[PDB]
Amino acid sequence: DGFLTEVGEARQGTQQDEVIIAVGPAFGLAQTVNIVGIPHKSILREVIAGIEEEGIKARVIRCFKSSDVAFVAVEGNRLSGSGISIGIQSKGTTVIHQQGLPPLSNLELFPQAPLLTLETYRQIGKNAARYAKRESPQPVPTLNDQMARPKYQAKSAILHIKETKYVVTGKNPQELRVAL
């Protein structure tokens, strides 16, 4: 069942060496796999592993104020001890954000969820950790498929409409405990 447990309102990091992974309001709940069937449990596992293999701590939170991946990520970079966060929607869309950047700007973006693999997710974790250590890592190789929208846009819209139902205005993020 649920591999994510709420441990209370997410608050400002107590140490600098951490990266916050902010997930959408339906992640691991009403939705458990991304747009191409990859389990959320596996995705989180890989992102965390990527961050930790870089000697950085991973801290997961859930955002409710918006289902937009940029704002989910901003919610997190605002509390991250390193200023760095990774936003992830249930459908899979991911972004590496940094406190101080405009909400719709970012460090790295993955605009085509259908193309991401568990390997990409791990690499996203590693790069985020490296940004946390103030390094300048080679950005994750750009993936682009002209038929991605033709084949998945409608499904993406539907999946988003569904996660958006879980948006709760004014509700601050909740830190989550990840079960093995």
Partner: protein, 551 residues
């Protein structure tokens, strides 16, 4: 067992596309939805008290903005009373001047004009579009990007694009920090292809305005607006912030248009149970209300939404028509992939291509689609020959022309060398001769040597953070053996001082001559009137490769 006839059909590319049955409650309906608001308007003491059935007490920011600035209230009640069918008839009637229609449309409410165009079939819509189009002469816009954000490739591809006929070219980024490099590369290459071509770099709003302030772009197009408040909000703006942004660009002498497109509200989760066309009509009115001169619409990036439902492609044509009918420049999409089928994407393109719009395509990909950073365009570099053939077949000016391989190679090479001189002169990571050569004969990034991305973005960012403006680019060119390109760059920069190309549908052709809806008025009055393909332009289109003299 199975019918082999059906197994053959099951393998067809079109069957890989996404289709869905209408779902009104979530906005999954292109147009003509029974749940859309009945048109209406009530005015008291000069102020709107009701807009399309909604009382002013329930107005959201979009309603307020439209009610206060997007409708000519002096005749709104008069026009509201007019028969919609008759109005639709007037739109396609070749004998009802454009000048007679604009005063009526600009007095209609969003629901009113939607009810009007919804009475029309696509042929009538195209018949009306050729008349309502603001600029007499149709144009074209292209995408120039690649998956590596390789500046050398962008320069070469941009030069080729300009040479083929595009009057506007747009780039964007895989890695946001690369922006400055992409813009400069696009600008230089474009001016080498044809001085006067306008360039843009689509990014997050504040980032793009800043980049424009530094002088590394000629205009901005993706200045987004949305049809519902929740979506607009997730878009990080309001009608007022975007209205302010519009004037900010003008205050810097930069041309700009807004961007919208049917299906965005659905894609972003809040269609508030309205049809795609109705919501897009609100976007068109926000654009008008803001005083913005043009709009890029026709679903654009969310084309996979309307295309999935019935009459979605027709609705796309309809929103383009509403735009032009409201006396707004219209960059009519045809810039995003939605189907695996060549037949289907062609039928979608012809809706705007046949009648002609200010920009038939607001993003024809001048690079193979695998390199298209807007996730693929409705047309790409490999379709250039087909495009020129159809222009020839139908005697239709599609804004492009056939070209000689020798001329393109030479133009791409010069653009690459010019950019090489810019980088050397500005102390940017070097562009090697091997790279110049690769960009010259390349088809896409697959033919380009890998660059040090970390290095490039480091310097790209110093351009923004250290405020290195466009004059440094001019200087680099002028002192690196490209006095001519430097002069052209300076001339394009000087265009931001006059304010002439800030007008409706303005582009810059020939020798620094501005061509807009103001000095190139569309005077359509039926057959043999208005813009007509002919003369040297017709001869240029007729001369396609492979057409041998039967002796």
């Amino acid at each position: 067992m199975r019918s082999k006839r059906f197994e053959a059909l099951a393998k067809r590319p079109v069957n890989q596309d996404g289709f869905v049955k209408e779902w009104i409650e979530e906005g999954f309906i292109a147009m003509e939805s029974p749940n859309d608001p009945k048109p209406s308007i009530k005015i008291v003491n000069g102020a709107v008290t009701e807009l399309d059935g909604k009382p002013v007490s329930d107005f959201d920011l979009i309603d307020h903005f439209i009610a206060r600035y997007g409708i000519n209230l002096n005749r709104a009640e008069e026009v509201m009373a007019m028969d919609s069918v008759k109005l639709a008839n007037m739109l396609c009637d070749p004998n009802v001047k454009r000048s007679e229609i604009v005063p009526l449309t600009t007095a209609m409410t969003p629901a009113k004009i939607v009810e009007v165009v919804s009475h029309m079939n696509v042929v009538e819509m195209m018949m009306a579009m050729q008349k309502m189009r603001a600029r007499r002469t149709p144009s074209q816009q292209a995408h120039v990007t690649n998956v590596k954000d390789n500046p050398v490739q962008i320069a070469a591809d941009a030069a080729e694009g300009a040479w083929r006929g595009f009057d506007e070219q747009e780039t964007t980024v895989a890695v946001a920090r690369y922006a400055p490099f992409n813009a400069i590369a696009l600008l230089v290459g474009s001016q080498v292809g044809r001085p006067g071509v306008l360039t843009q770099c689509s990014l997050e709003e504040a980032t793009e305005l800043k980049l424009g302030m530094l002088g590394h772009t000629c205009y901005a197009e993706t200045i987004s607006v949305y049809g519902t408040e929740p979506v607009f909000t997730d878009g990080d703006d309001t009608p007022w912030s975007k209205g302010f942004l519009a004037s900010s660009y003008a205050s810097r002498g930069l041309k700009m248009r807004f961007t919208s497109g049917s299906g965005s509200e659905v894609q972003m989760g809040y269609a508030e149970g309205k049809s795609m066309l109705y919501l897009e009509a609100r976007c068109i009115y926000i654009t008008k209300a803001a005083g913005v001169q043009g709009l890029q619409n026709g679903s654009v990036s969310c084309i996979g939404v309307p295309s999935a439902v019935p009459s979605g492609i027709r609705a796309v044509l309809a929103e383009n028509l509403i735009c032009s009918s409201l006396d707004l420049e219209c960059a009519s999409s045809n810039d995003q992939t939605f189907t695996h089928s060549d037949m289907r994407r062609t039928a979608r393109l012809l809706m705007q291509f046949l009648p002609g719009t200010d920009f038939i395509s607001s993003g024809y990909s001048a690079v193979p689609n695998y390199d298209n950073m807007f996730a693929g365009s409705n047309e790409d570099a490999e379709d250039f020959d087909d495009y020129n053939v159809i222009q020839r077949d139908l005697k239709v000016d599609g804004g492009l022309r056939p070209v000689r391989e020798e001329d393109v190679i030479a133009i791409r090479n010069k653009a690459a060398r010019a950019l090489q001189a810019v980088f050397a002169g500005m102390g940017l990571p070097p562009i090697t001769d091997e790279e110049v050569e690769a960009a010259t004969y390349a088809h896409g990034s697959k033919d380009m040597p890998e660059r040090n991305i970390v290095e490039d973005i480091k310097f790209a960012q110093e351009i923004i953070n250290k405020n290195r403006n466009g004059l440094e680019v001019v200087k680099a060119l002028a002192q690196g053996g490209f006095t001519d390109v430097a002069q052209d760059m300076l001339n394009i920069q000087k265009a931001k001082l006059t304010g002439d190309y800030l007008h409706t549908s303005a582009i810059i052709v020939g020798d620094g001559q501005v061509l807009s809806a103001v000095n190139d008025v569309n005077d359509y009055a039926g057959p043999a009137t208005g813009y007509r393909l002919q003369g040297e332009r017709w001869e240029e289109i007729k001369n396609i490769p492979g057409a041998l003299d039967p002796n």
